[PDB]
From Swiss-Prot:
Requires ascorbic acid for iron to be in the proper redox state. For the same enzyme from B.vulgaris (AC Q70FG7), presence of Fe(2+) is not necessary to detect activity. It is found in: Cytoplasm. It comes from Mirabilis jalapa (Garden four-o'clock). One of its GO terms (cellular component) is cytoplasm. Opens the cyclic ring of dihydroxy-phenylalanine (DOPA) between carbons 4 and 5, thus producing an unstable seco-DOPA that rearranges nonenzymatically to betalamic acid. Produces mainly (S)-betalamic acid. Required for the coloration of flowers. This is 4,5-DOPA dioxygenase extradiol. It is an enzyme of class 1 (oxidoreductase). Coiled coil: none annotated. Belongs to the DODA-type extradiol aromatic ring-opening dioxygenase family. Zn(2+) binds at residues 9, 47, 168, 222. Binds 1 zinc ion per subunit. Expressed in petals. Not detected in leaves, stems and roots. It catalyses: L-dopa + O2 = 4-(L-alanin-3-yl)-2-hydroxy-cis,cis-muconate 6-semialdehyde + H(+).
């Protein structure tokens, strides 16, 4: 495939498990999704929440274990990827050239939205990684425009990946164990239909249109990486669903999308 992706980083517990389909999908990334080695990777992280777009600019990525109450082994994982400082500067220029602000963090490593799926996709940790934050108090259209500014990166060998959670309710939302709560089916299906239809404006305006977005994304920070990845695919991309699974609690969903460009930018 070519283009950009919206993936789910999933449950860190899957590191210890054998039968999680999302992990199998991620492990097969280089065989089934992206054959060609990318020059660098831009991860739009649901777990880096800022006021204005921010990008990290480091030579070596720390591994940030920003998650609570997991088993000890999870905190010993190191994903020793190189940073991507030139990619970071290029993201800052592209955003500013489009009239958007962008700040640069020269210390922050990768949070688990980045390193956790990447350690399955690219276990050799030899691809330069740069993370981009989301701005959860801004709307879907903001995030789409951040991505649109970034689409020239596609012709430069950059793999752009939004890392979120397609259905990501509050911890207080009751479970439907080993099933799928109908509200979550409804939201997931609406989103799939909007994307496969090419109704990308609807996706940007999900708050006005999507059923049960209040349950699926009370904060939205796990959805907004989709808008950035979608915008980064340029005008009129074609979307396809490349993985779907659900957590055993029946209310977290991992629908995964590829956005294939049909247009390009100037020489
Ligand atoms: Fe998450």
């Amino acid at each position: 495939m070519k283009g950009t992706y919206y993936i789910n980083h999933g449950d860190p517990l899957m590191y210890l498990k054998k039968h999680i389909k999302l992990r199998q999908f991620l492990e097969g990334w280089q065989e089934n999704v992206v054959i060609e080695k990318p020059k660098s990777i831009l991860i739009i992280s649901a777990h880096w929440d800022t006021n204005v777009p921010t990008v990290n600019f480091v030579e070596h990525c720390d591994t940030i274990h920003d998650f609570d109450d997991y088993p000890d082994p999870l905190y010993q994982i190191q994903y020793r990827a190189p940073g991507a400082p030139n990619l970071a500067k290029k993201v800052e220029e592209l955003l500013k050239e489009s009239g958007m602000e962008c700040e640069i963090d020269t210390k922050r490593g990768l949070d688990h939205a980045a390193w956790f799926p990447l350690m399955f996709m690219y276990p050799e940790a030899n691809i330069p990684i740069c993370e981009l934050s989301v701005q959860p108090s801004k709307d879907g259209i903001h995030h789409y425009n951040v991505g649109k500014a970034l689409s020239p990166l596609l012709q430069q060998g950059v793999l752009i990946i939004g890392s979120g959670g397609t259905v990501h309710p509050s911890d207080d939302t009751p479970h439907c164990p080993n099933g799928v709560a109908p509200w979550a089916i409804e939201f997931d299906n609406w989103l799939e239909d909007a994307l496969l239809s090419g109704r990308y404006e609807d996706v940007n305006n999900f708050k006005k249109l999507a059923p049960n977005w209040e349950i699926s994304h009370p904060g939205q920070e796990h959805l907004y990486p989709l808008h950035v990845a979608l915008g980064a695919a340029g005008k009129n991309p074609k979307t396809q669903l490349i993985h779907r699974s659900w957590a055993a609690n029946g209310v977290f969903g991992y629908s995964t999308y590829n956005f294939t460009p049909t247009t390009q930018k100037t020489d």
